[PDB]
Design an enzyme around this catalytic site. Structure first.
Site, PDB file in Angstrom:
ATOM      1  N   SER A  39       1.356  -1.157  -6.572  1.00 37.64           N
ATOM      2  CA  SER A  39       1.739  -2.023  -7.348  1.00 37.64           C
ATOM      3  C   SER A  39       2.696  -1.534  -8.620  1.00 37.64           C
ATOM      4  O   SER A  39       2.400  -0.450  -8.888  1.00 37.64           O
ATOM      5  CB  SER A  39       0.569  -2.852  -7.819  1.00 37.64           C
ATOM      6  OG  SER A  39      -0.046  -3.630  -6.864  1.00 37.64           O
ATOM      7  N   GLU A  82       7.278 -35.747  -2.402  1.00 38.92           N
ATOM      8  CA  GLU A  82       6.441 -35.428  -3.779  1.00 38.92           C
ATOM      9  C   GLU A  82       7.261 -34.353  -4.433  1.00 38.92           C
ATOM     10  O   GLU A  82       8.299 -33.787  -4.019  1.00 38.92           O
ATOM     11  CB  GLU A  82       5.109 -35.023  -3.245  1.00 38.92           C
ATOM     12  CG  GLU A  82       4.979 -34.036  -2.320  1.00 38.92           C
ATOM     13  CD  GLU A  82       3.373 -33.416  -2.003  1.00 38.92           C
ATOM     14  OE1 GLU A  82       2.575 -33.892  -2.821  1.00 38.92           O
ATOM     15  OE2 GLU A  82       3.172 -33.163  -0.828  1.00 38.92           O
ATOM     16  N   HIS A 102       0.960  -1.180  -0.002  1.00 42.99           N
ATOM     17  CA  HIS A 102       0.111  -0.052   0.180  1.00 42.99           C
ATOM     18  C   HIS A 102       1.000   1.115  -0.083  1.00 42.99           C
ATOM     19  O   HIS A 102       0.451   2.251  -0.454  1.00 42.99           O
ATOM     20  CB  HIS A 102      -0.909  -0.114   1.354  1.00 42.99           C
ATOM     21  CG  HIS A 102      -2.192  -0.936   1.024  1.00 42.99           C
ATOM     22  ND1 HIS A 102      -2.810  -1.165   2.352  1.00 42.99           N
ATOM     23  CD2 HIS A 102      -2.567  -1.708   0.126  1.00 42.99           C
ATOM     24  CE1 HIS A 102      -3.578  -2.116   1.973  1.00 42.99           C
ATOM     25  NE2 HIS A 102      -3.279  -2.518   0.695  1.00 42.99           N
ATOM     26  N   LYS A 117     -11.961  -9.126 -12.678  1.00 40.27           N
ATOM     27  CA  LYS A 117     -10.989  -9.857 -13.347  1.00 40.27           C
ATOM     28  C   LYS A 117     -10.587 -10.872 -12.449  1.00 40.27           C
ATOM     29  O   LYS A 117     -10.351 -12.129 -12.681  1.00 40.27           O
ATOM     30  CB  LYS A 117      -9.839  -9.356 -13.798  1.00 40.27           C
ATOM     31  CG  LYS A 117      -8.819 -10.015 -14.569  1.00 40.27           C
ATOM     32  CD  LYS A 117      -7.691  -9.037 -15.077  1.00 40.27           C
ATOM     33  CE  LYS A 117      -6.854  -9.685 -15.638  1.00 40.27           C
ATOM     34  NZ  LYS A 117      -5.621  -8.620 -16.415  1.00 40.27           N
ATOM     35  N   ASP A 118     -10.420 -10.664 -10.976  1.00 40.67           N
ATOM     36  CA  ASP A 118     -10.261 -11.476  -9.846  1.00 40.67           C
ATOM     37  C   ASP A 118     -11.302 -12.651  -9.821  1.00 40.67           C
ATOM     38  O   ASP A 118     -10.963 -13.879  -9.896  1.00 40.67           O
ATOM     39  CB  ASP A 118     -10.212 -11.010  -8.833  1.00 40.67           C
ATOM     40  CG  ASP A 118      -8.813 -10.140  -8.595  1.00 40.67           C
ATOM     41  OD1 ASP A 118      -7.780 -10.090  -9.492  1.00 40.67           O
ATOM     42  OD2 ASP A 118      -8.649  -9.183  -8.049  1.00 40.67           O
TER      43      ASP A 118
END
Ligand code: HEM
Ligand code: HEM
Ligand code: FES
Lengths: 106, 379, 49, 67, 62, 81, 54
Positions: B205, B271, B201, B227-228
């Site tokens: 971004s 794994e 924040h 879009k999420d």
């Protein structure tokens, strides 16, 4: 010791310059630069005539990338024309601190 | 601010860390993971809970109980797989969230990066114990060495191993401990997330072009939420398909037999994601020096931001960096399959071949790249 | 000066109903919007199930 | 009695070439073994080779042949 | 000229969001009662005589 | 700071847009979009594939190399001795 | 078959929703994707004009 190869150097330059898409987005070299402190105050010393124009192209640029369109190639930037306008300001900020950096060493 | 209903509890004003948090215009579906990651986790907690509801951790009980789960428990078959298979999905969700960071150089933010670093290290052991919980044949033997692994400490290790054991062997209490650890541990992460987020924040971004986005922003709610939502919905089938029709695909562990300390499995592998490390682990004949590498393997991530070599952050404009970038991608995936191989002579060489390459890709090549390219554009 | 500005055409992305320049846009506007919402609502029924 | 579909489907594929082709190798092994079997030699390795593609053919057929 | 059901529909339902919300549950109800009822046939159409539903008739209550 | 207010300073830009209803969800999404898919796919595939080749090669290369190395004990040393 | 089922008693049932979900499944995806685009429509429809009086 390079003369003819110097001439040979520019092709890949021009080639490599053409190998990065921002040429094809209508950018220049300067606006590409990653930010830095010198970058910052350098911005201050710009006149608007560039500055604004710096802005719009960027703003122009981003939008296109949203829509995945590349600029029509005719309008792509040209390896003949690159504007260095940043750096003549940049060397000042670089220079002066190097003094302070050094003059404060001793 | 007159009669805004988002003021009245101040808590709603903390909420505007979202709805008005601005974002750049161009954002690739590459960015949808940070969302998913948290979402992949939410489900985990819940399912990982209801398990316990019928689960018992005991040397005698746990297996038969887990047997009993898919047997008599309503939908005991969907749930267990929802937990396990859902775990797997969280990984590939996660790595991309990493991959984005590099390929654009989003790591340029130092602290936020570091938080991710720690955040990563945490998650593995969770699954690790979570994988021991089945108390299957492998889970016994798998941890048996991986824990015994740490004995390579020259001095203090001897006590310390049996200590974490609480015994001379893998016996009961060594189980029970993990359960607690494996139980509590996510809550910790969830807290940490709220830290990791927090710095973001501050600076916001980044954008794919590796360029200051200041001039153009977006109100977050009307858009990226959507879009999420789709992005969220993408995940559904991804687990749903696997989890439902063909369970056992990435359910690659074959051991439903009771863990036998007397019996030893002819093949021993963790794994998948556990392998690629364990692959490097196989490589070095030196026991100690090998472990040293495995440690050093990941942590160089935090080092990487020291390696910013160029005047442009993103790799979308650097072919060679991009050339390099994709090159490294394979080197890993090889090791994966390599660690998925018995230790016959080509593989032996192969790992030795691919191993030194790995760091070499990072530790030598990548920095010099821009150095040329910085010089190339005459920067 | 300022008034030299003008609106370039968006007819492309449009759909033909109000595409005419001489029409009351309200004619379809009732039927026009409901298409957009009919989608939105039906989306939900599934989510609910 | 019933003879099974199997034994039948056994024969239909072993009829194929690579079957008898490698079946020779078995004997190429075997006969040489028969003299030399003192030494470690065994035709098992080849038997599997022999049987591998053999039943790869036998695969599709008899499962239909069965009930 | 009559309005296409769309022009009816919003005016009728989608205008008031409550109604717009209200119908949502309504059809969703009738939906599932019919919906699941169809797929199972399709399902059991696909698998014939593999299921007691078909099989168990052989032995069910003798 | 305050997110939308103070970020940058910008003058003499103009913006135009429509109601989303005014326009279509797929303005030639099929026809017009397919070329755009194609054109840019090559810019990557230049720099994408080459390594993927290498593994699969080595993958089979080693695979074979692995096989015969293992598979056949009487390969180099046959069972005369 | 007998053992194969034994280890998977849920099996022949577990495909019901397996079927059932897929029928349901194709419905939603475009709708969002449309509404997605529908919202985004205004975004990708933007037009810039740089007219510095300048
Ligand atoms: C990041 C979230 C989680 C991770 C990485 C994780 C890790 C794992 C893994 C890998 C397994 C093995 C799954 C299987 O064997 O089928 C497992 C099982 C289990 N986990 Fe977690 N788990 C998570 C969430 C949780 C939570 C929140 C809890 C406790 C509330 C929990 C408790 C259990 C239990 C009881 C089992 C027993 C089933 C089993 O071990 O097979 N898990 N866990
Ligand atoms: C469970 C693990 C993680 C979760 C839940 C998580 C969650 C998030 C979320 C929700 C965001 C905001 C979305 C975004 O900024 O794109 C984010 C951003 C970020 N995360 Fe994490 N992340 C995780 C792991 C990591 C790791 C391991 C790293 C790095 C070592 C990391 C580094 C970052 C960075 C650099 C950003 C900002 C990227 C940008 O803005 O361009 N994250 N993370
Ligand atoms: S010590 Fe047991 S295998 Fe290396």
């Amino acid at each position: 010791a390079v003369s003819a190869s110097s001439r040979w150097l520019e092709g890949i330059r021009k080639w490599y310059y053409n190998a990065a898409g921002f040429n094809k987005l209508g950018l220049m070299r300067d606006d590409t630069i990653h930010e830095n402190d010198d970058v910052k105050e350098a911005i201050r010393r710009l006149p608007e005539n560039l500055y604004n124009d710096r802005v719009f192209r960027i703003k122009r640029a981003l939008d296109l990338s949203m829509r995945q369109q590349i600029l029509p190639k005719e309008q792509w930037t040209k390896y003949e024309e690159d504007k260095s306008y940043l750096e003549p300001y940049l060397k000042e900020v670089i220079r002066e601190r190097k003094e302070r950096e050094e003059w404060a060493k001793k | 601010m007159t009669n805004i209903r988002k003021s009245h509890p101040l808590m709603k004003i903390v909420n505007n860390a979202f709805i008005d948090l601005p974002a750049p215009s161009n954002i690739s579906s590459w960015w949808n993971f940070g969302s998913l990651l948290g979402i992949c986790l939410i489900l985990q907690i819940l399912t990982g809970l209801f398990l316990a509801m019928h689960y018992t951790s005991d040397t005698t009980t746990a297996f038969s109980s887990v047997t009993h789960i898919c047997r008599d428990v309503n939908y005991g078959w969907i749930i267990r797989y929802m937990h396990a298979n859902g775990a797997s999905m969280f990984f590939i969700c996660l790595y991309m969230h990493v991959g984005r960071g590099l390929y654009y150089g989003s790591y340029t933010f130092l602290e936020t990066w570091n938080i991710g670093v720690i955040l990563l290290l945490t998650v593995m052991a969770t699954a690790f114990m979570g994988y021991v919980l089945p108390w299957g044949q492998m889970s016994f033997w798998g941890a048996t060495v991986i824990t015994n692994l740490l004995s390579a400490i020259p001095y203090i290790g001897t006590n310390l191993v049996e200590w974490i054991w609480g015994g001379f062997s893998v016996d009961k209490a060594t189980l029970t401990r993990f359960f607690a650890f494996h139980f509590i541990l996510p809550f910790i992460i969830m807290a940490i997330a709220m830290v990791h987020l927090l710095f973001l924040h501050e600076t916001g971004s980044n954008n794919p072009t590796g360029i200051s986005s200041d001039v153009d922003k977006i109100p977050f709610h009307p858009y990226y939420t959507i879009k999420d939502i789709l992005g969220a919905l993408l995940l559904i089938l991804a687990l749903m398909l696997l989890v439902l029709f063909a369970p056992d695909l990435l359910g690659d562990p074959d051991n439903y037999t009771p863990a036998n300390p007397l019996n030893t499995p002819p093949h021993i592998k963790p794994e998948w994601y556990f392998l690629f490390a364990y692959a490097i682990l196989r490589s070095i004949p030196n026991k100690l020096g090998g472990v040293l590498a495995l440690a050093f393997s990941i942590l160089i991530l935090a080092l990487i931001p020291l390696l910013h070599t160029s005047k442009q952050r993103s790799m979308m404009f650097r072919p060679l960096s991009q050339c390099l970038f994709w090159a490294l991608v394979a080197d890993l995936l090889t090791l994966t399959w390599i660690g998925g191989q018995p230790v016959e002579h080509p593989y032996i060489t192969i790992g030795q071949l691919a191993s030194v390459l790995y760091f070499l890709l990072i530790l030598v090549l990548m920095p010099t790249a821009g150095t040329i390219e910085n010089k190339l554009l005459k920067w | 000066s300022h008034t030299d500005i003008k609106v370039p055409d968006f007819s492309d992305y449009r759909r033909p109903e109000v595409l005419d320049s001489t029409k009351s846009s309200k004619e379809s506007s009732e039927a026009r919007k409901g298409f957009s919402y009919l989608v939105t609502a039906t989306t939900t029924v599934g989510v609910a199930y | 009695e019933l003879v099974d579909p199997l034994t039948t489907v056994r024969e239909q594929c072993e009829q194929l070439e690579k079957c008898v082709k490698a079946r020779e190798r078995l004997e190429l092994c075997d006969e040489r073994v028969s003299s030399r079997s003192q030494t470690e030699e065994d035709c098992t390795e080849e038997l599997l080779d022999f049987l591998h593609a053999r039943d790869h053919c036998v695969a599709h057929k008899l499962f239909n042949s069965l009930k | 000229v009559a309005p296409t059901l769309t022009a009816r529909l919003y005016s009728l339902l989608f205008r008031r969001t409550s109604t717009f919300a209200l119908t949502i549950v309504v059809g969703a109800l009738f939906f599932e009662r019919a919906f699941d009822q169809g797929a199972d046939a399709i399902y059991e159409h696909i698998n014939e005589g593999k299921l007691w539903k078909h099989i168990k008739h052989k032995y069910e209550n003798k | 700071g305050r997110q939308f207010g103070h970020l940058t300073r910008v003058r003499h830009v103009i913006t135009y847009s429509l109601s989303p209803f005014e326009q279509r969800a797929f303005p030639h999404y099929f026809s017009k979009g397919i070329p755009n898919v194609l054109r840019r796919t090559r810019a990557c595939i230049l720099r994408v594939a080459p390594p993927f080749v290498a593994f699969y090669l080595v993958y089979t290369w080693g695979t074979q190399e692995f096989e015969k190395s293992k598979r056949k004990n009487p390969a180099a040393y046959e069972n005369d001795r | 078959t007998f053992l194969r089922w034994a280890a998977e008693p849920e099996h022949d049932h577990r495909k019901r929703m397996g079927l059932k979900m897929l029928l349901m499944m194709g419905l939603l995806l475009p709708l969002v994707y449309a509404m997605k685009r529908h919202k985004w429509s205004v975004l990708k429809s933007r037009k810039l004009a740089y007219r510095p009086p300048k």
